[PDB]
Amino acid sequence: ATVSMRDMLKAGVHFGHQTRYWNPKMKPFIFGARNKVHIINLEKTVPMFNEALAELNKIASRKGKILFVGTKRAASEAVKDAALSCDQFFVNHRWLGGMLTNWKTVRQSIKRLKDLETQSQDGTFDKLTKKEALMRTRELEKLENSLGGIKDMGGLPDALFVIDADHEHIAIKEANNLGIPVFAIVDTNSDPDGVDFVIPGNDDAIRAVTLYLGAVAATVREGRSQLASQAEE
RNA sequence: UCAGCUCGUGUUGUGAAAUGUUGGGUUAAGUCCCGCAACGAGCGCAACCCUUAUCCUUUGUUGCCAGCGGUCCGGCCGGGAA
Ligand SMILES: [K+]
Ligand SMILES: [K+]
Ligand SMILES: [Mg+2]
Ligand SMILES: [Mg+2]
Ligand SMILES: [Mg+2]
Ligand SMILES: [Mg+2]
Ligand SMILES: [Mg+2]
């Protein structure tokens, strides 16, 4: 695709963790070690990323919903920006256990967030007796921080794209439970067993994270434009 | 009158069960915040009730007497609404 080994090398995709923290299941994707730090095999990274991008493009063309999951402090704002410029949904703060498997309950929180936003736009807060308004705006802030990116999702997504599979093991487990395909960036210290589409690469570097997110956003934009509530655009 | 006791859905365990409800703080309080495979909800806590402590408005008799006028010195009388 558009991404090539050279720009991943520039970003730092090939850097992993220290050898003592590795998961032995990452041995096929590990190229070697330098200064007691693993080096991911970009020669394997590139085609796997291309295949994941193609599958994401197909999912977007079929009018599917893409959930971008990443809550690390180095990928939160990047994930939010990618999802916003891609018109898909995101979770960039702490994943609530049961967001997908207990969606019938998380829906009520989504509705409460919508109602609080409507009240804020109305102006019932200054009608309220000050302390109640402060409590309600604090609740609005908390609900926006938690479920801001899935407010308009309206149901289970058709695909998850995850940064730091190990950090988001709960989301990946829920997606495996529900049958939702998982594309994920898997570092050398992570277990790739639950991931349908593994992309070995650095998940701690802001440059690499932005590279992955930009490629995914671009490919899903093309996939969406392929249908766009029409025949072919 | 102790701050406790539970449920739904989700998740863990072959199972009895567990989690939530534990943890760091804080409170009279499972009180509240932060964290967190939990997300929410109910009965309890608190508040809504009565009374007491301050002020304002209205009303002023059988209750009151500051300014007045008398007076048998008793708000006693005419009055006054302070
Ligand atoms: K056991
Ligand atoms: K339960
Ligand atoms: Mg990493
Ligand atoms: Mg208990
Ligand atoms: Mg218990
Ligand atoms: Mg309580
Ligand atoms: Mg808790």
Coordinates of C-alpha atoms (C1' of nucleotides) and ligand atoms in Angstrom, one line a residue:
Chain A
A1 CA 0.0 0.0 0.0
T2 CA 1.0 3.6 0.5
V3 CA 3.1 2.7 3.6
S4 CA 6.5 1.2 2.9
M5 CA 9.3 -0.2 5.0
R6 CA 11.3 3.0 4.7
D7 CA 8.8 5.3 6.5
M8 CA 8.2 2.7 9.2
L9 CA 11.9 2.7 9.8
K10 CA 11.9 6.5 10.0
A11 CA 9.0 6.4 12.5
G12 CA 10.5 3.7 14.6
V13 CA 8.2 0.7 14.0
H14 CA 11.1 -1.7 14.3
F15 CA 11.9 -1.1 18.0
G16 CA 10.4 -3.4 20.5
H17 CA 10.8 -4.1 24.3
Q18 CA 13.7 -5.5 26.2
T19 CA 14.3 -9.2 25.6
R20 CA 13.4 -10.1 29.2
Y21 CA 9.8 -8.9 28.7
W22 CA 9.2 -10.7 25.4
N23 CA 6.3 -13.1 24.7
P24 CA 7.7 -16.2 23.0
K25 CA 4.8 -16.2 20.6
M26 CA 6.3 -13.2 18.9
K27 CA 9.4 -15.1 17.8
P28 CA 8.2 -15.5 14.1
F29 CA 7.9 -11.7 13.9
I30 CA 11.1 -10.9 15.8
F31 CA 14.1 -10.2 13.5
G32 CA 16.8 -10.0 16.1
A33 CA 18.1 -8.2 19.2
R34 CA 20.3 -5.1 19.6
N35 CA 21.5 -3.8 23.0
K36 CA 19.1 -6.2 24.8
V37 CA 16.1 -4.8 22.8
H38 CA 14.2 -6.8 20.3
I39 CA 13.9 -5.6 16.6
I40 CA 10.6 -6.4 14.8
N41 CA 10.9 -7.8 11.3
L42 CA 9.6 -5.0 9.1
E43 CA 9.8 -7.5 6.1
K44 CA 6.9 -9.3 7.8
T45 CA 5.3 -6.1 9.2
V46 CA 4.7 -4.6 5.7
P47 CA 2.6 -7.4 4.0
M48 CA 0.6 -8.1 7.2
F49 CA -0.2 -4.4 7.5
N50 CA -1.2 -4.3 3.8
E51 CA -3.6 -7.2 4.3
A52 CA -5.1 -5.6 7.4
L53 CA -5.6 -2.4 5.5
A54 CA -7.3 -4.3 2.6
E55 CA -9.6 -6.1 5.0
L56 CA -10.5 -2.8 6.8
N57 CA -11.2 -1.2 3.4
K58 CA -13.6 -4.1 2.6
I59 CA -15.3 -3.7 5.9
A60 CA -15.7 0.1 5.4
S61 CA -17.0 -0.5 1.8
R62 CA -19.7 -2.8 3.3
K63 CA -20.7 0.2 5.5
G64 CA -19.2 -1.2 8.7
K65 CA -18.5 0.6 11.9
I66 CA -14.8 0.8 13.0
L67 CA -14.0 1.1 16.7
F68 CA -10.5 2.6 17.3
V69 CA -9.3 1.4 20.8
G70 CA -6.3 2.9 22.5
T71 CA -6.0 4.4 26.0
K72 CA -2.3 4.8 26.5
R73 CA -1.2 8.4 27.1
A74 CA 0.8 8.4 23.9
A75 CA -2.0 7.3 21.6
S76 CA -5.2 8.7 23.1
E77 CA -5.3 12.0 21.2
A78 CA -4.0 10.4 18.0
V79 CA -6.7 7.8 18.2
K80 CA -9.3 10.5 18.8
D81 CA -8.1 12.6 15.9
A82 CA -8.0 9.6 13.5
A83 CA -11.5 8.5 14.4
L84 CA -12.8 12.1 14.1
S85 CA -11.2 12.5 10.6
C86 CA -12.4 9.1 9.7
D87 CA -16.1 9.5 11.0
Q88 CA -15.8 6.2 12.9
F89 CA -16.0 5.6 16.6
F90 CA -13.3 5.5 19.3
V91 CA -12.4 4.7 22.9
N92 CA -9.4 6.6 24.0
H93 CA -9.9 6.6 27.8
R94 CA -10.2 3.6 30.1
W95 CA -12.2 0.8 28.5
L96 CA -15.3 0.0 30.6
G97 CA -15.4 -3.7 31.2
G98 CA -18.5 -5.0 29.3
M99 CA -18.7 -2.1 26.8
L100 CA -19.5 -4.7 24.1
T101 CA -20.5 -7.8 26.1
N102 CA -22.8 -5.7 28.4
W103 CA -23.8 -3.3 25.6
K104 CA -27.5 -3.6 26.7
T105 CA -26.4 -1.9 30.0
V106 CA -23.9 0.6 28.5
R107 CA -26.7 1.8 26.3
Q108 CA -28.4 3.4 29.3
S109 CA -25.3 5.3 30.1
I110 CA -25.1 6.5 26.5
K111 CA -28.7 7.7 26.7
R112 CA -28.0 9.5 30.0
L113 CA -25.0 11.2 28.4
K114 CA -27.3 12.3 25.5
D115 CA -29.9 13.6 27.9
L116 CA -27.3 15.5 29.9
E117 CA -25.9 17.1 26.7
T118 CA -29.4 18.1 25.7
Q119 CA -30.0 19.7 29.2
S120 CA -26.7 21.5 28.9
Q121 CA -27.6 22.9 25.5
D122 CA -31.0 23.8 26.8
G123 CA -30.0 25.7 30.0
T124 CA -31.6 23.7 32.8
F125 CA -28.4 23.8 34.7
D126 CA -28.7 27.5 35.7
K127 CA -32.3 26.7 36.6
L128 CA -31.0 24.1 39.0
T129 CA -29.9 25.1 42.5
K130 CA -26.1 25.6 41.7
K131 CA -24.8 22.5 43.5
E132 CA -27.1 20.3 41.5
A133 CA -25.9 22.0 38.3
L134 CA -22.2 21.4 39.3
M135 CA -23.0 17.7 40.1
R136 CA -24.8 17.3 36.7
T137 CA -22.0 19.0 34.7
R138 CA -19.4 16.8 36.5
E139 CA -21.4 13.7 35.5
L140 CA -21.6 15.1 32.0
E141 CA -17.8 15.5 31.9
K142 CA -17.3 11.9 33.2
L143 CA -19.7 10.4 30.7
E144 CA -18.1 12.4 27.9
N145 CA -14.7 11.2 28.9
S146 CA -15.8 7.6 29.1
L147 CA -18.3 7.2 26.2
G148 CA -17.7 10.3 24.1
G149 CA -16.4 8.4 21.1
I150 CA -19.2 5.8 20.9
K151 CA -22.1 8.2 21.5
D152 CA -23.6 7.8 18.0
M153 CA -22.4 4.2 17.4
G154 CA -25.9 2.8 18.1
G155 CA -24.9 -0.9 18.4
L156 CA -22.0 -3.4 18.2
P157 CA -19.2 -2.4 15.8
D158 CA -18.2 -4.6 12.9
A159 CA -14.4 -4.3 13.5
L160 CA -12.0 -3.2 16.2
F161 CA -8.6 -1.6 15.6
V162 CA -6.5 -1.8 18.7
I163 CA -3.2 -0.2 19.8
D164 CA -1.2 -2.2 22.4
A165 CA -3.1 -5.5 22.4
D166 CA -1.7 -6.3 25.8
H167 CA -2.9 -3.0 27.2
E168 CA -6.4 -3.6 25.6
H169 CA -6.6 -7.3 26.4
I170 CA -10.1 -6.7 27.9
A171 CA -11.5 -5.2 24.7
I172 CA -9.9 -7.9 22.6
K173 CA -11.4 -10.6 24.8
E174 CA -14.9 -9.0 24.5
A175 CA -14.5 -8.8 20.7
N176 CA -13.4 -12.5 20.5
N177 CA -16.5 -13.3 22.7
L178 CA -18.8 -11.5 20.4
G179 CA -17.2 -12.6 17.1
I180 CA -16.1 -9.1 16.1
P181 CA -12.8 -9.1 14.0
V182 CA -9.8 -7.6 15.7
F183 CA -7.0 -5.8 13.9
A184 CA -4.3 -4.9 16.4
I185 CA -0.8 -3.5 16.7
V186 CA 1.1 -6.2 18.6
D187 CA 4.4 -5.4 20.2
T188 CA 7.1 -8.0 21.1
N189 CA 5.8 -8.2 24.7
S190 CA 2.2 -9.0 23.7
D191 CA 0.2 -12.2 23.0
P192 CA -1.1 -12.3 19.4
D193 CA -3.5 -15.2 20.0
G194 CA -6.7 -13.3 20.2
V195 CA -6.0 -11.0 17.3
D196 CA -7.4 -11.8 13.9
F197 CA -5.1 -9.4 12.0
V198 CA -1.7 -9.0 13.7
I199 CA 0.4 -6.0 12.8
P200 CA 3.8 -6.4 14.6
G201 CA 5.3 -3.0 15.3
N202 CA 6.2 -0.5 18.0
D203 CA 3.1 0.7 19.9
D204 CA 4.9 3.0 22.3
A205 CA 6.2 5.6 19.8
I206 CA 3.9 8.5 18.8
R207 CA 5.4 8.5 15.3
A208 CA 4.6 4.9 14.7
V209 CA 1.1 5.2 16.3
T210 CA 0.3 8.2 14.1
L211 CA 1.6 6.3 11.0
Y212 CA -0.7 3.3 11.7
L213 CA -3.7 5.6 12.5
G214 CA -3.2 7.7 9.4
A215 CA -3.0 4.6 7.1
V216 CA -6.1 3.1 8.7
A217 CA -8.0 6.3 8.5
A218 CA -7.1 6.8 4.8
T219 CA -8.0 3.3 3.8
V220 CA -11.3 3.4 5.6
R221 CA -12.1 6.8 4.0
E222 CA -11.5 5.2 0.6
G223 CA -13.6 2.2 1.6
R224 CA -16.5 4.4 2.8
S225 CA -16.3 6.6 -0.3
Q226 CA -16.6 3.4 -2.3
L227 CA -20.3 3.2 -1.3
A228 CA -21.2 6.4 0.6
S229 CA -25.0 5.5 0.7
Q230 CA -24.7 5.2 -3.1
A231 CA -23.4 2.8 -5.8
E232 CA -19.8 3.9 -6.3
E233 CA -18.0 7.2 -5.4
Chain B
rU1 C1' -30.3 4.7 64.5
rC2 C1' -25.3 0.0 63.9
rA3 C1' -23.8 1.5 58.2
rG4 C1' -24.8 -1.8 56.5
rC5 C1' -27.9 -5.5 53.1
rU6 C1' -28.8 -6.9 48.1
rC7 C1' -30.3 -7.5 42.9
rG8 C1' -30.0 -7.3 37.2
rU9 C1' -26.7 -7.7 33.1
rG10 C1' -21.7 -8.7 32.1
rU11 C1' -17.1 -11.3 33.5
rU12 C1' -14.1 -15.4 36.6
rG13 C1' -14.5 -20.4 38.6
rU14 C1' -16.0 -27.9 37.0
rG15 C1' -18.6 -26.1 41.4
rA16 C1' -20.2 -24.0 46.3
rA17 C1' -19.3 -19.1 45.0
rA18 C1' -16.6 -14.4 43.4
rU19 C1' -16.6 -9.5 41.3
rG20 C1' -19.4 -5.1 41.8
rU21 C1' -19.5 -3.9 47.7
rU22 C1' -12.2 -4.7 47.2
rG23 C1' -7.9 -0.5 46.9
rG24 C1' -5.6 5.3 48.0
rG25 C1' -7.6 9.1 50.5
rU26 C1' -11.9 11.3 53.1
rU27 C1' -16.7 11.4 56.0
rA28 C1' -21.1 10.9 61.2
rA29 C1' -22.2 7.9 57.1
rG30 C1' -21.4 1.7 51.2
rU31 C1' -20.4 10.1 52.6
rC32 C1' -17.7 11.7 48.5
rC33 C1' -13.5 11.7 45.0
rC34 C1' -9.8 9.0 42.4
rG35 C1' -8.5 4.1 40.6
rC36 C1' -10.5 -0.3 39.0
rA37 C1' -13.8 -6.4 34.8
rA38 C1' -17.1 -4.3 35.9
rC39 C1' -21.6 -1.4 34.1
rG40 C1' -26.0 0.0 36.5
rA41 C1' -30.0 -0.3 40.1
rG42 C1' -32.8 -1.0 44.9
rC43 C1' -33.5 -1.0 50.5
rG44 C1' -30.7 1.6 54.1
rC45 C1' -27.2 7.2 54.9
rA46 C1' -28.4 12.4 53.8
rA47 C1' -32.6 15.5 52.4
rC48 C1' -37.9 16.4 52.3
rC49 C1' -41.4 16.5 58.3
rC50 C1' -42.1 18.9 63.7
rU51 C1' -39.8 22.0 67.2
rU52 C1' -36.1 25.5 69.1
rA53 C1' -32.4 30.1 68.1
rU54 C1' -32.6 35.7 64.3
rC55 C1' -35.2 39.1 61.1
rC56 C1' -39.3 40.9 57.7
rU57 C1' -44.7 41.5 56.1
rU58 C1' -49.9 41.0 57.5
rU59 C1' -53.6 41.1 61.7
rG60 C1' -54.3 43.4 66.6
rU61 C1' -58.8 40.8 71.0
rU62 C1' -59.8 38.5 75.7
rG63 C1' -53.3 39.9 74.3
rC64 C1' -49.5 45.0 74.5
rC65 C1' -48.4 50.3 76.6
rA66 C1' -43.5 53.7 73.6
rG67 C1' -45.4 58.8 72.6
rC68 C1' -50.1 61.5 74.5
rG69 C1' -54.7 63.3 77.7
rG70 C1' -56.9 62.2 82.4
rU71 C1' -56.7 59.2 86.7
rC72 C1' -59.6 56.7 92.6
rC73 C1' -52.2 55.3 90.7
rG74 C1' -55.2 49.9 89.4
rG75 C1' -53.5 49.9 81.0
rC76 C1' -57.9 51.9 85.4
rC77 C1' -60.3 55.1 81.3
rG78 C1' -60.1 58.0 76.3
rG79 C1' -56.7 56.2 73.1
rG80 C1' -52.3 54.4 70.4
rA81 C1' -50.5 49.7 66.4
rA82 C1' -44.9 51.6 68.4
Ligands
K1 K -10.6 -22.9 42.1
K2 K -23.6 -11.1 39.3
MG3 MG 5.0 -1.6 23.6
MG4 MG -20.9 -5.9 52.7
MG5 MG -19.0 -9.9 48.2
MG6 MG -25.4 5.3 49.5
MG7 MG -15.2 0.7 43.2

